[PDB]
Every structure is written in structure tokens, then in C-alpha cells.
């Protein structure tokens, strides 16, 4: 399944988070690096939610929800896509 990520430029390369998964952050030096790191972050994060009994995120929303997300505008965020297979 294709997931949206919000990413931001750093000195090393990029970092960001899943806008649908509160608290799930990741980073990488190249786009290939940060997509790998994001998948890793995803897996570690979902398993923690399930272990703790916290709400699990839902699949990606309507495109309007991302186009209207002020976090992109605020800090020089870019929308990316990662394939994740649970």
C-alpha cells in the first residue's frame, strides 16, 4: 500500500513523518535512504501501538486532506510516497 510522507530538508539530507501516523518519524541522506528508513519506522511504530493498546492509524485519506494540510506550507514540506507491505 502507498503511504504519504511529509519530508523536510536537513543538512544531512531529509527527515519527516507519516502525516497519517502521529509520532512516526524517520530520516535519510538520499530519497532511497529515507524510503527505507520510513518503512522501518512504520513497522517499529505499528508494533509499539499494538503492544501498548493505542489507536492504529487508518489507510491514506482523500487527496484533499494532504493538499489542504498546513504543515506542508509552514516549513517547506514536500509530499512523497512509500510502498509499505504489512
Amino acid at each position: 500500500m502507498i503511504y504519504p510522507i511529509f519530508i523536510f530538508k536537513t543538512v544531512e539530507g531529509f527527515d519527516g513523518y507519516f502525516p497519517d501516523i502521529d509520532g512516526c518519524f524517520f530520516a535519510g541522506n538520499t530519497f532511497a535512504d529515507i524510503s527505507k528508513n520510513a518503512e522501518e519506522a512504520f513497522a517499529v511504530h505499528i508494533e509499539a501501538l499494538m503492544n501498548e493498546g493505542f489507536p492504529l492509524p487508518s489507510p491514506p485519506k482523500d487527496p484533499h486532506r494532504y493538499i489542504d494540510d498546513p504543515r506542508l506550507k509552514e516549513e517547506g514540506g514536500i509530499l512523497g510516497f512509500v510502498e509499505i507491505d504489512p
Binding site: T10, E12, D22, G23, G28, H45, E74, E75
Partner: protein, 66 residues
């Protein structure tokens, strides 16, 4: 701000490290805070963290980071 600095600020705010798992040369740490039904997942080490990330981290942790 480095990954490690951000983690310590979260600990100061009462977030607790659950452990960390091996990764693309680095790792990811998860944190939870008693009474909060959120997880924070961070890559480490990172020498620099974007203001975009920090801003979102502020929202999840409910504190300022500066």
C-alpha cells in the same frame, strides 16, 4: 539539534524509552509517556533535525523544543 538531544528533551518531559531496533546503519527508538496514548518513533543518530520535524514533534509531545 541532534536526535540524541531531542530524545533527552522528551525524557525531561516525562517520555520513556521503550527500547530501540536495528536499522539502515542507525536505529529507531520508541518512546511512550504514562497517560498519553501516543508513541513517538525517532531515527538515531541524526546530526541535524529539520524545523518541520521539530514542529510536529512539539505537537505530539505537547512541549516547545528550542
Amino acid at each position: 539539534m541532534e536526535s540524541g538531544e531531542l530524545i533527552k528533551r522528551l525524557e525531561d518531559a516525562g517520555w520513556q524509552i521503550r527500547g530501540g531496533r536495528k536499522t539502515n546503519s542507525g536505529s529507531h527508538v520508541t518512546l511512550c509517556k504514562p497517560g498519553v496514548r501516543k508513541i513517538i518513533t525517532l531515527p538515531y543518530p541524526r546530526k541535524d533535525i529539520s524545523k518541520g520535524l521539530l514542529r510536529q514533534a512539539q505537537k505530539i509531545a505537547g512541549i516547545k523544543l528550542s
